[PDB]
Scaffold this active site. Sequence first.
Site, PDB file in Angstrom:
ATOM      1  N   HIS F  61      25.898  81.465 -23.429  1.00 49.75           N
ATOM      2  CA  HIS F  61      24.892  80.377 -23.483  1.00 49.75           C
ATOM      3  C   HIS F  61      25.196  79.322 -22.424  1.00 49.75           C
ATOM      4  N   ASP F  91      13.279  73.687   8.876  1.00 51.93           N
ATOM      5  CA  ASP F  91      13.940  74.549   7.878  1.00 51.93           C
ATOM      6  C   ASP F  91      15.303  73.912   7.566  1.00 51.93           C
ATOM      7  N   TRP F 126      33.218  78.307 -22.458  1.00 50.80           N
ATOM      8  CA  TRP F 126      32.901  78.317 -20.997  1.00 50.80           C
ATOM      9  C   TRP F 126      34.050  77.725 -20.177  1.00 50.80           C
ATOM     10  N   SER F 156      28.312  80.988  -3.692  1.00 51.02           N
ATOM     11  CA  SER F 156      26.881  80.649  -3.534  1.00 51.02           C
ATOM     12  C   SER F 156      26.758  79.132  -3.330  1.00 51.02           C
ATOM     13  N   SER F 157      27.313  78.352  -4.252  1.00 54.22           N
ATOM     14  CA  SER F 157      27.128  76.892  -4.271  1.00 54.22           C
ATOM     15  C   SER F 157      27.899  76.217  -3.125  1.00 54.22           C
ATOM     16  N   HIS F 240      34.475  67.845 -14.679  1.00 53.65           N
ATOM     17  CA  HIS F 240      33.821  66.523 -14.777  1.00 53.65           C
ATOM     18  C   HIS F 240      32.863  66.373 -13.588  1.00 53.65           C
ATOM     19  N   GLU F 242      31.331  68.644 -12.112  1.00 51.85           N
ATOM     20  CA  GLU F 242      30.236  69.571 -12.405  1.00 51.85           C
ATOM     21  C   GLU F 242      29.154  68.886 -13.252  1.00 51.85           C
ATOM     22  N   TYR F 244      28.268  65.786 -13.238  1.00 50.09           N
ATOM     23  CA  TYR F 244      27.520  64.896 -12.319  1.00 50.09           C
ATOM     24  C   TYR F 244      26.632  65.740 -11.375  1.00 50.09           C
ATOM     25  N   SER F 255      13.692  59.320 -10.031  1.00 52.21           N
ATOM     26  CA  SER F 255      13.294  58.245  -9.103  1.00 52.21           C
ATOM     27  C   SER F 255      11.919  58.553  -8.488  1.00 52.21           C
ATOM     28  N   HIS F 290      39.742  62.867 -19.627  1.00 49.78           N
ATOM     29  CA  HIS F 290      39.030  62.522 -20.893  1.00 49.78           C
ATOM     30  C   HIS F 290      38.611  63.801 -21.630  1.00 49.78           C
ATOM     31  N   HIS F 291      38.762  64.971 -21.012  1.00 50.14           N
ATOM     32  CA  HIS F 291      38.602  66.293 -21.704  1.00 50.14           C
ATOM     33  C   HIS F 291      39.902  66.745 -22.375  1.00 50.14           C
ATOM     34  N   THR F 316      25.580  53.601 -13.536  1.00 49.82           N
ATOM     35  CA  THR F 316      24.530  54.366 -14.253  1.00 49.82           C
ATOM     36  C   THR F 316      23.501  53.371 -14.834  1.00 49.82           C
ATOM     37  N   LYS F 319      20.953  52.287 -12.360  1.00 51.32           N
ATOM     38  CA  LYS F 319      19.849  53.266 -12.174  1.00 51.32           C
ATOM     39  C   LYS F 319      18.838  53.119 -13.313  1.00 51.32           C
ATOM     40  N   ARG F 438      33.754  72.410 -33.331  1.00 54.68           N
ATOM     41  CA  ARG F 438      33.096  73.262 -32.332  1.00 54.68           C
ATOM     42  C   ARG F 438      33.528  74.718 -32.487  1.00 54.68           C
TER      43      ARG F 438
HETATM   44  C1  HEA Z   1      24.685  66.156 -17.555  1.00 51.02           C
HETATM   45  C2  HEA Z   1      25.830  66.331 -18.134  1.00 51.02           C
HETATM   46  C3  HEA Z   1      26.718  65.236 -18.528  1.00 51.02           C
HETATM   47  C4  HEA Z   1      26.705  63.896 -18.112  1.00 51.02           C
HETATM   48  C5  HEA Z   1      25.875  63.168 -17.087  1.00 51.02           C
HETATM   49  C6  HEA Z   1      27.821  63.323 -18.943  1.00 51.02           C
HETATM   50  C7  HEA Z   1      28.135  61.921 -18.802  1.00 51.02           C
HETATM   51  C8  HEA Z   1      29.158  61.212 -19.490  1.00 51.02           C
HETATM   52  N1  HEA Z   1      30.021  61.857 -20.302  1.00 51.02           N
HETATM   53 FE1  HEA Z   1      30.034  63.808 -20.926  1.00 51.02          FE
HETATM   54  N2  HEA Z   1      30.109  65.796 -21.398  1.00 51.02           N
HETATM   55  C9  HEA Z   1      29.309  66.770 -20.979  1.00 51.02           C
HETATM   56  C10 HEA Z   1      28.191  66.545 -20.101  1.00 51.02           C
HETATM   57  C11 HEA Z   1      27.818  65.324 -19.506  1.00 51.02           C
HETATM   58  N3  HEA Z   1      28.432  64.168 -19.749  1.00 51.02           N
HETATM   59  C12 HEA Z   1      29.692  68.106 -21.381  1.00 51.02           C
HETATM   60  C13 HEA Z   1      29.069  69.426 -21.111  1.00 51.02           C
HETATM   61  C14 HEA Z   1      30.847  67.871 -22.200  1.00 51.02           C
HETATM   62  C15 HEA Z   1      31.673  68.847 -22.956  1.00 51.02           C
HETATM   63  C16 HEA Z   1      32.474  69.723 -22.078  1.00 51.02           C
HETATM   64  C17 HEA Z   1      33.077  70.798 -23.012  1.00 51.02           C
HETATM   65  O1  HEA Z   1      34.109  70.484 -23.682  1.00 51.02           O
HETATM   66  O2  HEA Z   1      32.507  71.933 -23.094  1.00 51.02           O
HETATM   67  C18 HEA Z   1      30.981  66.401 -22.171  1.00 51.02           C
HETATM   68  C19 HEA Z   1      32.129  65.804 -22.695  1.00 51.02           C
HETATM   69  C20 HEA Z   1      32.525  64.454 -22.510  1.00 51.02           C
HETATM   70  C21 HEA Z   1      33.838  63.914 -22.995  1.00 51.02           C
HETATM   71  C22 HEA Z   1      34.942  64.679 -23.651  1.00 51.02           C
HETATM   72  C23 HEA Z   1      34.777  64.504 -25.166  1.00 51.02           C
HETATM   73  C24 HEA Z   1      35.694  65.491 -25.909  1.00 51.02           C
HETATM   74  O3  HEA Z   1      35.699  66.733 -25.559  1.00 51.02           O
HETATM   75  O4  HEA Z   1      36.428  65.077 -26.859  1.00 51.02           O
HETATM   76  C25 HEA Z   1      33.768  62.503 -22.627  1.00 51.02           C
HETATM   77  C26 HEA Z   1      34.919  61.601 -22.787  1.00 51.02           C
HETATM   78  O5  HEA Z   1      34.913  60.498 -22.294  1.00 51.02           O
HETATM   79  C27 HEA Z   1      32.472  62.349 -21.916  1.00 51.02           C
HETATM   80  C28 HEA Z   1      31.952  61.077 -21.475  1.00 51.02           C
HETATM   81  C29 HEA Z   1      30.808  60.870 -20.711  1.00 51.02           C
HETATM   82  C30 HEA Z   1      30.558  59.555 -20.114  1.00 51.02           C
HETATM   83  C31 HEA Z   1      31.238  58.238 -20.369  1.00 51.02           C
HETATM   84  C32 HEA Z   1      29.433  59.810 -19.270  1.00 51.02           C
HETATM   85  C33 HEA Z   1      28.736  58.791 -18.447  1.00 51.02           C
HETATM   86  O6  HEA Z   1      28.455  59.364 -17.169  1.00 51.02           O
HETATM   87  C34 HEA Z   1      27.483  58.257 -19.157  1.00 51.02           C
HETATM   88  C35 HEA Z   1      27.004  56.970 -18.499  1.00 51.02           C
HETATM   89  C36 HEA Z   1      25.645  56.556 -19.013  1.00 51.02           C
HETATM   90  C37 HEA Z   1      25.408  55.515 -19.813  1.00 51.02           C
HETATM   91  C38 HEA Z   1      26.442  54.629 -20.429  1.00 51.02           C
HETATM   92  C39 HEA Z   1      23.971  55.242 -20.196  1.00 51.02           C
HETATM   93  C40 HEA Z   1      23.134  54.334 -19.273  1.00 51.02           C
HETATM   94  C41 HEA Z   1      23.734  52.978 -19.062  1.00 51.02           C
HETATM   95  C42 HEA Z   1      23.162  51.791 -19.466  1.00 51.02           C
HETATM   96  C43 HEA Z   1      21.809  51.622 -20.147  1.00 51.02           C
HETATM   97  C44 HEA Z   1      23.940  50.532 -19.102  1.00 51.02           C
HETATM   98  C45 HEA Z   1      24.586  49.815 -20.237  1.00 51.02           C
HETATM   99  C46 HEA Z   1      25.664  50.591 -20.977  1.00 51.02           C
HETATM  100  C47 HEA Z   1      26.828  50.065 -21.431  1.00 51.02           C
HETATM  101  C48 HEA Z   1      27.302  48.639 -21.286  1.00 51.02           C
HETATM  102  C49 HEA Z   1      27.739  50.955 -22.211  1.00 51.02           C
HETATM  103  N4  HEA Z   1      31.654  63.468 -22.004  1.00 51.02           N
HETATM  104  C1  HEA Z   2      22.248  72.982 -19.308  1.00 48.81           C
HETATM  105  C2  HEA Z   2      23.056  73.144 -20.301  1.00 48.81           C
HETATM  106  C3  HEA Z   2      22.609  73.406 -21.709  1.00 48.81           C
HETATM  107  C4  HEA Z   2      21.288  73.453 -22.303  1.00 48.81           C
HETATM  108  C5  HEA Z   2      20.005  73.197 -21.662  1.00 48.81           C
HETATM  109  C6  HEA Z   2      21.587  73.804 -23.709  1.00 48.81           C
HETATM  110  C7  HEA Z   2      20.550  73.985 -24.653  1.00 48.81           C
HETATM  111  C8  HEA Z   2      20.690  74.296 -26.018  1.00 48.81           C
HETATM  112  N1  HEA Z   2      21.885  74.473 -26.592  1.00 48.81           N
HETATM  113 FE1  HEA Z   2      23.738  74.425 -25.755  1.00 48.81          FE
HETATM  114  N2  HEA Z   2      25.583  74.367 -24.880  1.00 48.81           N
HETATM  115  C9  HEA Z   2      25.876  74.117 -23.640  1.00 48.81           C
HETATM  116  C10 HEA Z   2      24.896  73.842 -22.640  1.00 48.81           C
HETATM  117  C11 HEA Z   2      23.501  73.764 -22.812  1.00 48.81           C
HETATM  118  N3  HEA Z   2      22.902  74.003 -23.970  1.00 48.81           N
HETATM  119  C12 HEA Z   2      27.305  74.129 -23.322  1.00 48.81           C
HETATM  120  C13 HEA Z   2      27.962  73.789 -22.034  1.00 48.81           C
HETATM  121  C14 HEA Z   2      27.932  74.412 -24.603  1.00 48.81           C
HETATM  122  C15 HEA Z   2      29.394  74.535 -24.949  1.00 48.81           C
HETATM  123  C16 HEA Z   2      29.828  76.002 -24.839  1.00 48.81           C
HETATM  124  C17 HEA Z   2      31.279  76.156 -25.333  1.00 48.81           C
HETATM  125  O1  HEA Z   2      31.602  75.566 -26.411  1.00 48.81           O
HETATM  126  O2  HEA Z   2      32.130  76.812 -24.615  1.00 48.81           O
HETATM  127  C18 HEA Z   2      26.774  74.560 -25.458  1.00 48.81           C
HETATM  128  C19 HEA Z   2      26.993  74.765 -26.844  1.00 48.81           C
HETATM  129  C20 HEA Z   2      25.962  74.767 -27.825  1.00 48.81           C
HETATM  130  C21 HEA Z   2      26.214  74.754 -29.282  1.00 48.81           C
HETATM  131  C22 HEA Z   2      27.553  74.609 -29.941  1.00 48.81           C
HETATM  132  C23 HEA Z   2      28.110  75.981 -30.278  1.00 48.81           C
HETATM  133  C24 HEA Z   2      29.437  75.885 -31.015  1.00 48.81           C
HETATM  134  O3  HEA Z   2      30.180  74.873 -30.807  1.00 48.81           O
HETATM  135  O4  HEA Z   2      29.733  76.775 -31.840  1.00 48.81           O
HETATM  136  C25 HEA Z   2      24.874  74.756 -29.866  1.00 48.81           C
HETATM  137  C26 HEA Z   2      24.632  74.682 -31.313  1.00 48.81           C
HETATM  138  O5  HEA Z   2      23.534  74.440 -31.782  1.00 48.81           O
HETATM  139  C27 HEA Z   2      23.932  74.801 -28.750  1.00 48.81           C
HETATM  140  C28 HEA Z   2      22.520  74.952 -28.867  1.00 48.81           C
HETATM  141  C29 HEA Z   2      21.593  74.785 -27.832  1.00 48.81           C
HETATM  142  C30 HEA Z   2      20.174  74.808 -28.141  1.00 48.81           C
HETATM  143  C31 HEA Z   2      19.534  75.092 -29.470  1.00 48.81           C
HETATM  144  C32 HEA Z   2      19.536  74.511 -26.914  1.00 48.81           C
HETATM  145  C33 HEA Z   2      18.083  74.383 -26.743  1.00 48.81           C
HETATM  146  O6  HEA Z   2      17.770  72.991 -26.576  1.00 48.81           O
HETATM  147  C34 HEA Z   2      17.647  75.186 -25.556  1.00 48.81           C
HETATM  148  C35 HEA Z   2      16.092  75.160 -25.504  1.00 48.81           C
HETATM  149  C36 HEA Z   2      15.513  75.761 -24.281  1.00 48.81           C
HETATM  150  C37 HEA Z   2      15.324  75.140 -23.126  1.00 48.81           C
HETATM  151  C38 HEA Z   2      15.810  73.786 -22.938  1.00 48.81           C
HETATM  152  C39 HEA Z   2      14.575  75.879 -21.974  1.00 48.81           C
HETATM  153  C40 HEA Z   2      15.435  76.251 -20.956  1.00 48.81           C
HETATM  154  C41 HEA Z   2      14.634  76.813 -19.794  1.00 48.81           C
HETATM  155  C42 HEA Z   2      14.065  76.194 -18.745  1.00 48.81           C
HETATM  156  C43 HEA Z   2      14.124  74.696 -18.510  1.00 48.81           C
HETATM  157  C44 HEA Z   2      13.380  77.142 -17.768  1.00 48.81           C
HETATM  158  C45 HEA Z   2      12.321  76.384 -17.016  1.00 48.81           C
HETATM  159  C46 HEA Z   2      11.326  77.261 -16.301  1.00 48.81           C
HETATM  160  C47 HEA Z   2      10.729  76.787 -15.181  1.00 48.81           C
HETATM  161  C48 HEA Z   2      11.078  75.397 -14.622  1.00 48.81           C
HETATM  162  C49 HEA Z   2       9.709  77.646 -14.496  1.00 48.81           C
HETATM  163  N4  HEA Z   2      24.592  74.911 -27.488  1.00 48.81           N
HETATM  164  O1  LIG Z   3      31.938  65.764 -18.598  1.00 49.61           O
HETATM  165  O2  LIG Z   3      31.509  64.357 -19.230  1.00 49.61           O
HETATM  166 CU   LIG Z   4      33.952  64.687 -18.172  1.00 47.21          CU
END
Ligand code: HEA
Ligand code: HEA
Ligand SMILES: [O-][O-]
Ligand SMILES: [Cu+2]
Lengths: 44, 258, 40, 75, 227, 513, 56, 72, 91
Positions: F61, F91, F126, F156-157, F240, F242, F244, F255, F290-291, F316, F319, F438
Amino acid sequence: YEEGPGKNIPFSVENKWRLLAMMTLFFGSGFAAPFFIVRHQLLK
Amino acid sequence: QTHAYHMVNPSPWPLTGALSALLMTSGLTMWFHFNSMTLLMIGLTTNMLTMYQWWRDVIRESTFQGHHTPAVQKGLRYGMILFIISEVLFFTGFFWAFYHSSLAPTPELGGCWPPTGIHPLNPLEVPLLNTSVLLASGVSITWAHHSLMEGDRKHMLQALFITITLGVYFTLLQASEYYEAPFTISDGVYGSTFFVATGFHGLHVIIGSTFLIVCFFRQLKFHFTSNHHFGFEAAAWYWHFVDVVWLFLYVSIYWWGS
Amino acid sequence: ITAKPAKTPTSPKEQAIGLSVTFLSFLLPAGWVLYHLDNY
Amino acid sequence: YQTAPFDSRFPNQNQTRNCWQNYLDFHRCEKAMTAKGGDVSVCEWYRRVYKSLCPISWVSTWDDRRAEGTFPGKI
Amino acid sequence: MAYPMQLGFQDATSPIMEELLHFHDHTLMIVFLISSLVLYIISLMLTTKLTHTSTMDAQEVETIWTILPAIILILIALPSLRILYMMDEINNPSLTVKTMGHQWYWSYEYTDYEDLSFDSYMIPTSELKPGELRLLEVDNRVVLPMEMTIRMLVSSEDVLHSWAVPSLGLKTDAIPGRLNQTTLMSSRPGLYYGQCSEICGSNHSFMPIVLELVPLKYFEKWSASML
Amino acid sequence: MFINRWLFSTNHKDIGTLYLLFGAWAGMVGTALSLLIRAELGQPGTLLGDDQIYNVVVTAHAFVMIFFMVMPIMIGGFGNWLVPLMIGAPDMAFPRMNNMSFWLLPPSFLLLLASSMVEAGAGTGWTVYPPLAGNLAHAGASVDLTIFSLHLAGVSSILGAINFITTIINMKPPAMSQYQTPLFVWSVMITAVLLLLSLPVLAAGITMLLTDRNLNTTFFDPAGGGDPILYQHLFWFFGHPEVYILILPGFGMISHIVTYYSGKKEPFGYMGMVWAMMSIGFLGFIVWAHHMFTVGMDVDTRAYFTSATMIIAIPTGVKVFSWLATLHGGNIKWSPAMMWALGFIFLFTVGGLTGIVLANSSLDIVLHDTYYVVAHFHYVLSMGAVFAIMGGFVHWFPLFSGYTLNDTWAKIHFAIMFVGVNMTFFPQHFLGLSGMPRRYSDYPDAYTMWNTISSMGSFISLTAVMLMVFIIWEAFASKREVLTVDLTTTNLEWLNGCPPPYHTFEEPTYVNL
Amino acid sequence: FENRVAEKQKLFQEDNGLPVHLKGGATDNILYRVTMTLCLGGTLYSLYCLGWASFP
Amino acid sequence: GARTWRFLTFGLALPSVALCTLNSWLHSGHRERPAFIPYHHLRIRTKPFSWGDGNHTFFHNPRVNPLPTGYE
Amino acid sequence: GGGVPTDEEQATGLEREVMLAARKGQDPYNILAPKATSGTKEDPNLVPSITNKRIVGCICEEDNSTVIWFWLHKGEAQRCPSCGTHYKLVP
Ligand code: HEA
Ligand code: HEA
Ligand SMILES: [O-][O-]
Ligand SMILES: [Cu+2]
Ligand SMILES: CCCCC/C=C\C/C=C/C/C=C\C/C=C\CCCC(=O)O[C@H](COC(=O)CCCCCCCCCCCCCCCCC)COP(=O)(O)OCCN
Ligand SMILES: CCCCCC/C=C\CCCCCCCCCC(=O)O[C@H](COC(=O)CCCCCCCCCCCCCCC)COP(=O)(O)OC[C@@H](O)CO
Ligand SMILES: CCCCCC/C=C\CCCCCCCCCC(=O)O[C@H](COC(=O)CCCCCCCCCCCCCCC)COP(=O)(O)OC[C@@H](O)CO
Ligand SMILES: CCCCCCCCCCO[C@@H]1O[C@H](CO)[C@@H](O[C@H]2O[C@H](CO)[C@@H](O)[C@H](O)[C@H]2O)[C@H](O)[C@H]1O
Ligand SMILES: CCCCCCCCCCO[C@@H]1O[C@H](CO)[C@@H](O[C@H]2O[C@H](CO)[C@@H](O)[C@H](O)[C@H]2O)[C@H](O)[C@H]1O
Ligand SMILES: CCCCCCCCCCO[C@@H]1O[C@H](CO)[C@@H](O[C@H]2O[C@H](CO)[C@@H](O)[C@H](O)[C@H]2O)[C@H](O)[C@H]1O
Ligand SMILES: CCCCCCCCCCO[C@@H]1O[C@H](CO)[C@@H](O[C@H]2O[C@H](CO)[C@@H](O)[C@H](O)[C@H]2O)[C@H](O)[C@H]1O
Ligand code: CUA
Ligand SMILES: [Mg+2]
Ligand code: NA
Ligand SMILES: [Xe]
Ligand SMILES: [Xe]
Ligand SMILES: [Xe]
Ligand SMILES: [Xe]
Ligand SMILES: [Xe]
Ligand SMILES: [Zn+2]
């Protein structure tokens, strides 16, 4: 090469019913694959 | 067109390259698990055919067709710099692994570095000779570059031949030191770090030597002008990268890690 | 945005057919597998 | 003696080296005391500390390796 | 343990878990307020026919939008880091207990005085006694003295596991070749449950933790009877 | 002609089209995997099998959604289509290398699907942590096929990043500075720099895992003096950045969509938006541990990673506030794309705020490896990255195809998806606070209500995905050809018509100083 | 060696509509056919190997 | 200029290589191999190697590389 | 010590066309940014084209981040819709 709407794509949109079949097979095959992989793993 | 950029002819090499990557990876899987080298040997062959034809076509486009305007050359400069940066970060991961293991040696090692039962190579013997060889090759390639800019065909060829000979000397010395080493890749994290880090480095030396040999044959065939010779610049930048990685390996693994 | 009228209009009946076919292409194969889990 | 006290040399979550150091210290002391046929009772503090901290399987593995001649620490 | 329809944390059993609840209350108020303000401002921007589509000057407003968030983060970090350093503080434990993670069960070693160790396995669903909890009960509980500072050391003999007890605020990874320390102190007697918290293979879901907190004298007799 | 055009392409638009088709197919795979997860959890007990089959599905997934859906659609699809058009370039810098970035993905996907078909699959997460991912606890080919899948996706990337950075630096009109390029172009350049620096460190780490599994190295094996925690540092040093990489091109599309449907010529605070994206990119490299708050690192290290992670909220927030200030005073067009973008601003904000909760190591002790983390990342991925993808798809579909969508259908699609994703993920906060771990195939009975509601939400999202396929069919079926597009003076990508000719900017733009 | 670049410039600029990978003449077609045959054949063999490895 | 970099190639760089070649030459020749001890952190075998009998490293030297069971 | 060809001797195709045009101070392949005139109706910006229309981007004031894009057609001078700057196509 052909230019314009319906020509800048690797699939034909000349016939909407042929297109429905092609889209059905394309998206359907992706959605089906994980169910058939689970079936495969359960059957070992 | 009234811009200076290169519209590339439709090409099969991206697809043959991508499939060569599938054949090499599925081939390594088949070698590690199913006791067979066949897929891997097909993948290596298609990979070499792809590289040969792709870079042949870049030479046709530039030397023979004139598509490498200054704007195109500036793009290639950026591309090679960015590629080298990615290769630096790849090696950074191996240096991280090395420092992690050596700065905090675990009880299994005896709690010391080098580990109990490891007899490191003397860094003042072949490792120091390898250092002199790659540094010397950095001087000779610089001579080759200046000869080419000054329009001197004979001295460019002599300097580039010396550079390649030193790259080959380094490779032969490293092969000999691998065979003579009393430790192996299976000798815990010492062997793991030593052979994987120096081994990827050795692969980069072979790649860079190959690139220099391509430049040597292109020079023999008069492809380079005194002002236009990006393949030579790129090979020289790559070669300096290989030198610098060696100096970090030497100081880190061979000297500080001994 | 502005656009021309459809060159090949898709009537409500034609839309019901495309929507039905689309949903069945997702639902029948997955439904077949999940129905047969015990058998697996 | 209740359990191993806080040791300023090992103040962090990772207590691996604390177990290791006390196991080494016990065995070095024991060797020093048996060589002169001195008294191993002077080694007792290290014994209690390593027994408190060290997993049974680590001690068991280390003891086996000392018998085999494959223990990599200096005693 | 968790109860049906639970929204927040399990009730605190340790002083540090109490601290984490009050810190979470403070942080959640901020999450609620900022989320609410953003939703409100979206709705405000979208509910007028009045327009202003010419270029707008940004610098004055960007001061407010960097300074006010910086101040909010400082107000979170201060109590966050006070709690981080409180847990890390020197406490003088009375007892050391080791736990070793295995596929798929926990072992416990109490080796301050005698050689006490045992294995702790999930009660199968078909063998639960009436009133017992599915996936949470074990055959052999981790008996511990209440109202006492305990040093728990955590490792593994195979893959990663993680030793967790939410109501005490505890989660320590179980890493082979590593001995991780945490401290446990229960304010109350009773039964406190946790579950393996690092993916460890086929029965990750099925290797729970049960602490049994009793008076020292009961813990001493139990210890003696388990040799 | 067909092979020359579609297998031998050197054209940025056709390659972008290939990436969008690939990502769409990947999205259907990732959706099916997500429904298998929620089917297993939708009632207490066991549906499929034990945690191995369950975690093969969870692992696949994540890899499919991240590497085969989000990155190919945002970077390969939108980036290839839009970046050259937005800078008036004929291009990409390396049009043939571009085609190899695309063609590496089908083989990458094939290796992932092979991993799940051989032996018992890779049930690792993953993150692929050892020793569960090692040759004792995961003997056989599955994990090696997963590692090779990641190698091909990474090449690729990396080559794509070299291409985007070179194109964006070198192929603008000579009068156009970096400070006259659109925000989407900035978002792709910054994402490309993150890829170039992060993927090689992942490559090193998974290569070490491959040699520990096959060549008797011991990087991660304590028996040889290795350390499982070293793998986690190498993985997260990539992982981390990734996240972003996953959101930055979304920020860029948001935007453009907010600006366009507000009737504005420009986003609010352009240089602040550039600053914010560069600041997020930089800070994204110094926060990875933080992971790892539960692995046993030192207290001062935990204090540093807490503090550095929280700093990301400042750029953030600039933005988020700048998007709100772009709406301010707009002639608002309530297009489907605008609805996606407004949903993004709110739901991304919620998920970013639960990230700030998690940044607090003390509280993360209790939240780590619980559904609170799952709730955080699905707010930012399944309601942030995905909402930006859907907004960009419905905004630019008429440019790419020359045909219009049915806006009423697209609004229905938005409404169903909005309900489904919120019903799925909102209750997971409660499951995490109350301690549900999890990667569990089954849960103690107390967690039943929220798991039931979450699974019902996932089925509503499935209905939205099925409707999206119908809506694309209906557009190509009906053939409503685009006539006039508003605001071309500040949206160069539309100025060559719909769709643009195969070759655009053969004669470059005229821009004076 | 003599400088024969001018003769290769004439060959590769000939107005014959050939793409650059075939413009050298008949040897280019042969090497293309060998490469593509090994790639596509090898890919079919990799799929067979997956089929085989997917079952005990 | 080219003249200066040739001067450095022949006047400094190759003399350095010659002197280090001499140094290595003079310190060549086999040192006595150490007593075999079957340390558990060395001669790691978690999976057979994919060549030979599965128990020999890729550049196995019988003189200085013992197997898990000792020297050949 | 010679034997290396010069660009003058061996450059070919578009590379050579760019090389020879630069010697003459000409820019047929648009390598240089054109210098603005006052942009009045009397003194319009002169925009070369090989066809009867070309896209103009107008940076209306120094350091604007917003570029204003429009098609300029053969015939009467057109004005930037943001700043009114005059542009005239010279096909
Ligand atoms: C698009 C993907 C994405 C993005 C952008 C982020 C963004 C952030 N993530 Fe997250 N994160 C994940 C995807 C993402 N994360 C994934 C996939 C995991 C799990 C990985 C795994 O274990 O599989 C995860 C896990 C993860 C952890 C580990 C938790 C754990 O495993 O125990 C933490 C810890 O700090 C973290 C923090 C944050 C923070 C602080 C941001 C910041 O960038 C957020 C900043 C944004 C805001 C705060 C909101 C807007 C701001 C305002 C409106 C201003 C005012 C706000 C304040 C004064 C607070 N995230
Ligand atoms: C991009 C990242 C992404 C997205 C979109 C999702 C989408 C969803 N995810 Fe998950 N998920 C992860 C990334 C993502 N996930 C990751 C990183 C983990 C952790 C894995 C691990 O623990 O190792 C995870 C784990 C995770 C769990 C925890 C499993 C566990 O801990 O046992 C669950 C449980 O409900 C869940 C459910 C879903 C569901 C119901 C959706 C639904 O919201 C999805 C619905 C469908 C869509 C959103 C459509 C997608 C398709 C398009 C957008 C195509 C568009 C086509 C054109 C533009 C032409 N996912
Ligand atoms: O990765 O937050
Ligand atoms: Cu992180
Ligand atoms: C002068 C030195 C030149 C090196 C040439 C040697 C071999 C071919 C491969 C070279 C590539 C480099 C590194 C790969 C990993 C390990 C090899 C390390 C170097 C080496 O050659 O190590 C040898 C072991 O080789 C072994 O296991 C052999 C293993 C052979 C199979 C290698 C597996 C390939 C791994 C996959 C690569 C992934 C690449 C990732 C790309 C990134 C994408 C983003 C050492 O011999 P020994 O007998 O143990 O000790 C000496 C005792 N007298
Ligand atoms: C056992 C070992 C096997 C392993 C396989 C890899 C082995 C060998 C690969 C060796 C690399 C050879 C590259 C040859 C490039 C020839 C084409 C060339 O150099 O092309 C030049 C352009 O540069 C350009 O494209 C620059 C192109 C740069 C490419 C360099 C790439 C380094 C390759 C690394 C490959 C894998 C590394 C990863 C290892 C983890 C052409 O422009 P000019 O020179 O200006 O000429 C024009 C003048 O004549 C006009 O007057
Ligand atoms: C176990 C195995 C797992 C790994 C799988 C291996 C993956 C794939 C197989 C690779 C097949 C390679 C075939 C040669 C590719 C040559 C690319 C090249 O040389 O690309 C050039 C651009 O990149 C440049 O310069 C600079 C960049 C040149 C890079 C060359 C190739 C790199 C291959 C691997 C790189 C990963 C990096 C390692 C660090 C992590 C040319 O760009 P084009 O668009 O062609 O032309 C533009 C025209 O104007 C030229 O006249
Ligand atoms: C144009 C394409 C069409 C041609 C098709 C390719 C034909 C390939 C046939 C060769 O097969 C090989 O046979 C070797 C001898 O059996 C194998 O070595 C295997 O067995 C050896 C014998 O003991 C061991 O030493 C090796 O370690 C081991 O990998 C090897 O794997 C395998 O590749
Ligand atoms: C991009 C970054 C690259 C980094 C390169 C590699 C970094 C290696 C530096 C050393 O690492 C340290 O190792 C110590 C042990 O040697 C640890 O001490 C911990 O572990 C010991 C036992 O292992 C205990 O005794 C200590 O108290 C305890 O703080 C300490 O925390 C850690 O920093
Ligand atoms: C997560 C995605 C899935 C969501 C749920 C899908 C909704 C179900 C769609 C219908 O699926 C079908 O259901 C039938 C039953 O209603 C099955 O017939 C089965 O049951 C019939 C009734 O007993 C028999 O007549 C048939 O032979 C037998 O195959 C049939 O195979 C299956 O395709
Ligand atoms: C351009 C088109 C692409 C060409 C495709 C060609 C495919 C033909 C491959 C032949 O298959 C062979 O089968 C051997 C057995 O029949 C295997 O030997 C290996 O497996 C044997 C099993 O019996 C053992 O003897 C050893 O492990 C080893 O020799 C080995 O996998 C493989 O070479
Ligand atoms: Cu043990 Cu999860
Ligand atoms: Mg964890
Ligand atoms: Na279940
Ligand atoms: Xe917060
Ligand atoms: Xe799967
Ligand atoms: Xe998959
Ligand atoms: Xe992947
Ligand atoms: Xe990678
Ligand atoms: Zn203007």
